[PDB]
Amino acid sequence: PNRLIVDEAINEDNSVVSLSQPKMDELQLFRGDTVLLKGKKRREAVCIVLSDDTCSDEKIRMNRVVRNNLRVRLGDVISIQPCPDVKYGKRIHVLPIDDTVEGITGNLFEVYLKPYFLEAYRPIRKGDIFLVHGGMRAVEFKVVETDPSPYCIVAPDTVIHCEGEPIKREDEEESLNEVGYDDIGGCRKQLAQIKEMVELPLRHPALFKAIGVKPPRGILLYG
Amino acid sequence: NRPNRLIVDEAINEDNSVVSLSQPKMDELQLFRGDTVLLKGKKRREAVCIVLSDDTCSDEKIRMNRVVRNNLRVRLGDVISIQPCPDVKYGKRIHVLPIDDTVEGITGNLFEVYLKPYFLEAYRPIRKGDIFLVHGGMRAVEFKVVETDPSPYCIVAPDTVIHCEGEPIKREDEEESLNEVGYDDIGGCRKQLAQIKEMVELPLRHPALFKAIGVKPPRGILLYGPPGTGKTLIARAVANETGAFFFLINGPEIMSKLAGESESNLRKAFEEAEKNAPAIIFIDELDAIAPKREKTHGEVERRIVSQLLTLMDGLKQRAHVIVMAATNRPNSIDPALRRFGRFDREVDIGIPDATGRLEILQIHTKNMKLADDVDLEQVANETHGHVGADLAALCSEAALQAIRKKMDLIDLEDETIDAEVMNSLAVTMDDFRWALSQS
Amino acid sequence: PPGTGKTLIARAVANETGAFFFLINGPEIMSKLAGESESNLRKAFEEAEKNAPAIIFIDELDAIAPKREKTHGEVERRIVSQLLTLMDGLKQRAHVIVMAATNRPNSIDPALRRFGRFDREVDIGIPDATGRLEILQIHTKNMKLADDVDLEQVANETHGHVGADLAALCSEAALQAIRKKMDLIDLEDETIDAEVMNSLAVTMDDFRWALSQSN
Ligand SMILES: Nc1ncnc2c1ncn2[C@@H]1O[C@H](COP(=O)(O)OP(=O)(O)O)[C@@H](O)[C@H]1O
Ligand SMILES: Nc1ncnc2c1ncn2[C@@H]1O[C@H](COP(=O)(O)OP(=O)(O)O)[C@@H](O)[C@H]1O
Among candidate residues C125, C158, C186, the one where a domain is terminated: C125
- Specify the CATH number for the domain of residue C116: 3.40.50.300
Same domain for C102 and C137, yes or no, is no
Alpha helices, DSSP H only, in B86-230? Answer: 116-119, 190-205, 209-212
Beta bridge pairs of residue A159: A91
Cα C43 to Cα B306, C14, C22, C39, C183: the distances in Å are: 20, 19, 11, 6, 51
Same domain for C23 and C98, yes or no, is yes
Q: Is B187 helix (H, G, I), strand (E, B) or coil?
A: coil
Contact across the interface for A207 and B396, Cβ inside 8 Å: no
Decide: B66 and B182 in contact? Cβ < 8 Å. yes
Residues of B in contact with A209 (CB under 8 A): 104-105
Confirm or reject contact between B108 and chain A (CB < 8 A): no
Spatial separation of the C-alpha atoms in residues B338 and B342, rounded to whole Å: 6
Dihedral pair phi/psi, residue A5, rounded to 5°: -90, 130
Same domain for C102 and C149, yes or no, is no
Same domain for C118 and C131, yes or no, is no
Decide: A37 and A45 in contact? Cβ < 8 Å. yes
CA-based nearest residue in chain C for residue B300: C33
> Which technique was used to obtain these atomic coordinates?
X-ray
State the count of interchain CB pairs (< 8 A) between B and C: 79
Query: B45 CB contacts (<8 Å, ≥6 apart)?
Result: B71, B72, B73, B129
Same domain for C137 and C97, yes or no, is no
Burial tier of B53 (Cβ tally within 10 Å: 0-12, 13-18, 19+): middle
Chain C interface, best mutation among B222, B267, B293, by max C CB count within 10 A:
B293
Same domain for C83 and C180, yes or no, is no
Residue of B107, B393, B400 lying closest to A200 (CB–CB): B400
CA dihedral B69, B72, B74, B79 (to 10 degrees): -100
Same domain for C121 and C150, yes or no, is no
Confirm or reject contact between A204 and chain B (CB < 8 A): yes
CA of B229 to the centre of ligand 1 (A): 5
Ligand with an atom nearest the CA of residue B286: 1
Q: Which domain holds residue C102?
A: 1-125
Residues of A in contact with B404 (CB under 8 A): 196, 199-200
Spatial separation of the C-alpha atoms in residues B307 and C109, rounded to whole Å: 23
What single string gives the DSSP state of each residue in B46-112? Answer: EEEEEEEE-TTS-TTEEEE-HHHHHHTT--TT-EEEEEE-TT--B-SEEEEEEBGGGTTT--S--II
Same domain for C144 and C210, yes or no, is yes
User: Which chains sit next to B, with 3 or more Cβ pairs under 8 A?
Assistant: A, C
Q: How far apart are the first and last CA of chain B?
A: 54
Counted residue by residue, chain A has a size of: 223
A5: left (phi over 0), alpha (psi -120 to 50) or beta: beta
C116: left (phi over 0), alpha (psi -120 to 50) or beta: left
Work out the angle at residue B130's Cα, subtended by the Cα atoms of residues B128 and B135, and round it to the nearest 5 degrees.
Answer: 135
Cα B17 to Cα B38, B132, B147: the distances in Å are: 11, 9, 17
Q: At what angle do helices C129-139 and C163-184 cross, to 10 degrees?
A: 40
Spatial separation of the C-alpha atoms in residues B83 and B128, rounded to whole Å: 18
Resolution limit, Å: 3.0
Among candidate residues C104, C125, C146, the one where a domain is terminated: C125
Contact across the interface for A211 and B105, Cβ inside 8 Å: yes
Breaks following residues of chain B (C-to-N distance > 2.5 Å): none
Decide: A54 and A81 in contact? Cβ < 8 Å. no
Cα C133 to Cα A12, B78, C137, C163, C164: the distances in Å are: 86, 38, 6, 10, 13
Q: Is B2 helix (H, G, I), strand (E, B) or coil?
A: coil
Work out the angle at residue B71's Cα, subtended by the Cα atoms of residues B202 and B36, and round it to the nearest 5 degrees.
Answer: 110
Same domain for C121 and C131, yes or no, is no
Confirm or reject contact between C2 and chain B (CB < 8 A): yes
Residues of C in contact with B1 (CB under 8 A): 186-188
Same domain for C103 and C11, yes or no, is yes
Beta bridge pairs of residue B333: B291
Q: How many CA atoms lie within 13 A of C89 on its CB side?
A: 10
Same domain for C20 and C59, yes or no, is yes
Counting the structural domains of chain C, the total is: 2
Contact across the interface for B422 and A3, Cβ inside 8 Å: no
Q: How far apart are the first and last CA of chain C?
A: 14
Q: Is B166 helix (H, G, I), strand (E, B) or coil?
A: coil
CA of B204 to the centre of ligand 1 (A): 23
- Shortest distance between the Cα of B297 and any Cα of chain C, in A, equals 7
Residues of B in contact with A3 (CB under 8 A): 411
- Specify the CATH number for the domain of residue C184: 1.10.8.60
Q: Where does ligand 2 bind, in terms of residues with CB under 6 Å?
A: B 340; C 2-8, 101, 127, 135, 138, 163-164, 167
Contact across the interface for A210 and B105, Cβ inside 8 Å: yes
Domains annotated on chain B, with CATH: 1-87 (2.40.40.20), 89-165 (3.10.330.10), 179-350 (3.40.50.300), 352-439 (1.10.8.60)
CA-based nearest residue in chain A for residue B398: A213
Among candidate residues C125, C144, C159, the one where a domain is terminated: C125
Spatial separation of the C-alpha atoms in residues C96 and C92, rounded to whole Å: 8
Same domain for C96 and C142, yes or no, is no
- E-assigned strand segments in A83-125: 91-96, 122-125
Alpha helices, DSSP H only, in chain C? Answer: 6-16, 26-31, 36-50, 74-88, 129-139, 151-157, 163-184, 194-198, 204-211
DSSP class of A97: B
Ligand with an atom nearest the CA of residue B356: 1
Of B186, B222, B223, B233, the residue with max ligand 1 atoms within 8 A of its CB, to mutate for a pocket test, comes to: B233
